Amino acid sequence: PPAVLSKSGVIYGKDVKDLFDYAQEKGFAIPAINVTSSSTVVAALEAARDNKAPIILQTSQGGAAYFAGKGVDNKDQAASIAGSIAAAHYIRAIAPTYGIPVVLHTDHCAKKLLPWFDGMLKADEEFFAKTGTPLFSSHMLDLSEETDDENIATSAKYFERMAKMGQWLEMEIGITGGLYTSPETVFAVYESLHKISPNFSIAAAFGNVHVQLRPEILGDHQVYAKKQIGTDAKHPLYLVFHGGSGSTQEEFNTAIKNGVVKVNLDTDCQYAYLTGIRDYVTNKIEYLKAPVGNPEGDKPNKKYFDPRVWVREGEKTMSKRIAEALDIFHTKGQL
Amino acid sequence: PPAVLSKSGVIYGKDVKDLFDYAQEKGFAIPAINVTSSSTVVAALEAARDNKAPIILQTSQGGAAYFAGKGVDNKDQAASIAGSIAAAHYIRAIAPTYGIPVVLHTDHCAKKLLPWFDGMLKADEEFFAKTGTPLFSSHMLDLSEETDDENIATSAKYFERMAKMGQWLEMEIGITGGELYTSPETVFAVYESLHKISPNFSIAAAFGNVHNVQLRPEILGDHQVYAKKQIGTDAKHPLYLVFHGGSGSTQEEFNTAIKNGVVKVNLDTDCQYAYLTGIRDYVTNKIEYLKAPVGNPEGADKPNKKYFDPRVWVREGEKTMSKRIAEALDIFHTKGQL
Numbered sequence A: 001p002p003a004v005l006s007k008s009g010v011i012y013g014k015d016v017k018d019l020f021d022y023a024q025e026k027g028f029a030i031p032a033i034n035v036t037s038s039s040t041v042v043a044a045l046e047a048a049r050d051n052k053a054p055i056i057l058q059t060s061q062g063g064a065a066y067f068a069g070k071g072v073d074n075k076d077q078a079a080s081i082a083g084s085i086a087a088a089h090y091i092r093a094i095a096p097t098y099g100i101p102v103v104l105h106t107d108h109c110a111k112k113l114l115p116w117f118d119g120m121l122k123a124d125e126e127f128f129a130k131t132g133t134p135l136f137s138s139h140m141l142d143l144s145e146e147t148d149d150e151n152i153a154t155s156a157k158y159f160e161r162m163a164k165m166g167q168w169l170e171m172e173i174g175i176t177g178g179l180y181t182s183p184e185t186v187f188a189v190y191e192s193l194h195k196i197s198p199n200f201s202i203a204a205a206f207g208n209v210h211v212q213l214r215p216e217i218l219g220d221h222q223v224y225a226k227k228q229i230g231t232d233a234k235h236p237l238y239l240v241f242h243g244g245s246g247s248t249q250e251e252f253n254t255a256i257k258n259g260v261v262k263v264n265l266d267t268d269c270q271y272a273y274l275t276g277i278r279d280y281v282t283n284k285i286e287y288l289k290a291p292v293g294n295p296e297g298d299k300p301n302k303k304y305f306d307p308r309v310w311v312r313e314g315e316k317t318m319s320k321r322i323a324e325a326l327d328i329f330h331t332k333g334q335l
Numbered sequence B: 001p002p003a004v005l006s007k008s009g010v011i012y013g014k015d016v017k018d019l020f021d022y023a024q025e026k027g028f029a030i031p032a033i034n035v036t037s038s039s040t041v042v043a044a045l046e047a048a049r050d051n052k053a054p055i056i057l058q059t060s061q062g063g064a065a066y067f068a069g070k071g072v073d074n075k076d077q078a079a080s081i082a083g084s085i086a087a088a089h090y091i092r093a094i095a096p097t098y099g100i101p102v103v104l105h106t107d108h109c110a111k112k113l114l115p116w117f118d119g120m121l122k123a124d125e126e127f128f129a130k131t132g133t134p135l136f137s138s139h140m141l142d143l144s145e146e147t148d149d150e151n152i153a154t155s156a157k158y159f160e161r162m163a164k165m166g167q168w169l170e171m172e173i174g175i176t177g178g179e180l181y182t183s184p185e186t187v188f189a190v191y192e193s194l195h196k197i198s199p200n201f202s203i204a205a206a207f208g209n210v211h212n213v214q215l216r217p218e219i220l221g222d223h224q225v226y227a228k229k230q231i232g233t234d235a236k237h238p239l240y241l242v243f244h245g246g247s248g249s250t251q252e253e254f255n256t257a258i259k260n261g262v263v264k265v266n267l268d269t270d271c272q273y274a275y276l277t278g279i280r281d282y283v284t285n286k287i288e289y290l291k292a293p294v295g296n297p298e299g300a301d302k303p304n305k306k307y308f309d310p311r312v313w314v315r316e317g318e319k320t321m322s323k324r325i326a327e328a329l330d331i332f333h334t335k336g337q338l
């Protein structure tokens, strides 16, 4: 039973691999929560701690720039860089308080956003040089629109640099090549990256739109790589499940059995966080400065407009949503 | 033209004193905004960069506990400690991007809440020895409900720890006795004992600023005149004074306070309300705010993702909070001072 399960805070290095191996041994996936604010970070960590689960927090390119603020010019990725770095420091500072291991990750980065990747890496190296761990646990590349050769080459280039800090890389491959992702395509991703380090996961195109979901193809990848490596391991790969919301428990179940360790579903969470604040539409009569239907012409509506009151409703409704995912992915109780 | 006017990010030590001396001399005060989230930090920093102004960000005990999460038990001030620390790293990390000096401060901390103060000072000291600077620019102590000699005494001991780091202390004193407005005699007692330790401190007196009695910013002039003669200096402002919680004061009441040497003004309610308004005004798109099924174009065939994305509606509250902050930076003549 790996030490990572009894740690609290952001985890790095071997702790990330041990966590993902544990997920595969025990048959569970860990949801990946896009976070855009201290308030969405809080809702995710709280859902995870209350369900005694590990969790992945990730910033997308736009989430990271929202952490910087939308009024910060982002023509040259300076806002995604600075904001991903500020979220990283915030999350590291508060995450230990929730008593759970946390994987700090960054989301889709296609070729035209590699300057944002570049900025995080430099920061990671800096941090790594003075503290012994990088700043982010994990990064994603999504060169799936490039040729698979170019995607694999560029991933590998970045991965070499990432492997010096034992940092995890998630990479996405699609159906471009030079319909689903063929198992031999996935294996070429494995062949290059495994040469550098084992610390990497693959998001393949298996009907997950983001005409039908084909989670069993993830098993064909695992079987193909099984026979190529000559191993008895059921799961030679670490697999990731992107988007395509509305998939049922059986679909998530065959994907997890086939070695998926991580599931991103961001429209679910975005909508969930709105509802609690949105339903604070019933208190609209008490939502002007003094003037309230309840009593006074003259009442102080301060106990109603305090953001600590209403924002907490979105946190509450996001956290419940994440609690559902945590059970559906069998990650509840796993610590 | 002090250096601090040209710096980006959270400022410390003497840069704080410089900023306040420059506030006192050019006749402006600086709004202190309560933050409870990254979103609300962003709103304050954006309004200050947009209006070329320095700004103070502060976490109340409850705001700091909010940054940790309401789900985090706070019986021993634990949420308030972790949350303010985590706000400090976040604010320190993002503030340089907005290009303005930022005072990172903490709000009203009474006797019962001193564990929160202990936990913050503990973290400032570790961080100081690692880096040469504390986490927080300044901290506030509010022991006004305690006897006045007990207030000056606890505040002197804490101020002696903060002065190793060059940290700024703001202390509040009320109308209590121990051996109706704060007397200039009583105010000078505070200055007497704290100034021996370091000059990096400001004072919040009870001058009718409810939080019977009328608002009297003229007594803060009485404070300066009393101290000035009792010291011998000939400068107008031997005290750094702060204006707490001035519910709807006039422009002239604020001008009186500023010219009597107030450098810092906080009023929490307005910001809170302003942040809400922008988000509350996304009640005009209620019909687009359930999943997948939109009134406007097509039910269960037109997606609502682009409207319920929090990056959209939260921004609206940010924008209306910064407009109010911008109006406050005008009112306190802090606009454009960089």
Ligand SMILES: Nc1ccc(NC(=O)c2ccccc2[SeH])cc1
Residues within 6 Å of the ligand: A031, A032, A033, A263, A264, A265, A266, A268, A269, A272, A321, A322, A324, A325, A328
């Ligand atoms: N009924 C139901 C359906 C789907 C889900 N999955 C999620 O929410 C999820 C998954 C990954 C990341 C974030 C979330 Se909020 C949870 C519950």
Ligand SMILES: Nc1ccc(NC(=O)c2ccccc2[SeH])cc1
Residues within 6 Å of the ligand: B031, B032, B033, B265, B266, B267, B268, B270, B271, B324, B325, B327, B328, B331
């Ligand atoms: N018309 C008007 C009246 C008062 C104010 N003052 C403020 O807002 C303020 C002051 C201090 C701290 C935060 C804010 Se939002 C601003 C505008």
Ligand SMILES: [Zn+2]
Residues within 6 Å of the ligand: A108, A142, A172, A203, A210, A242
């Ligand atoms: Zn993808």
Ligand SMILES: [Zn+2]
Residues within 6 Å of the ligand: B108, B142, B172, B204, B211, B244
């Ligand atoms: Zn006060």
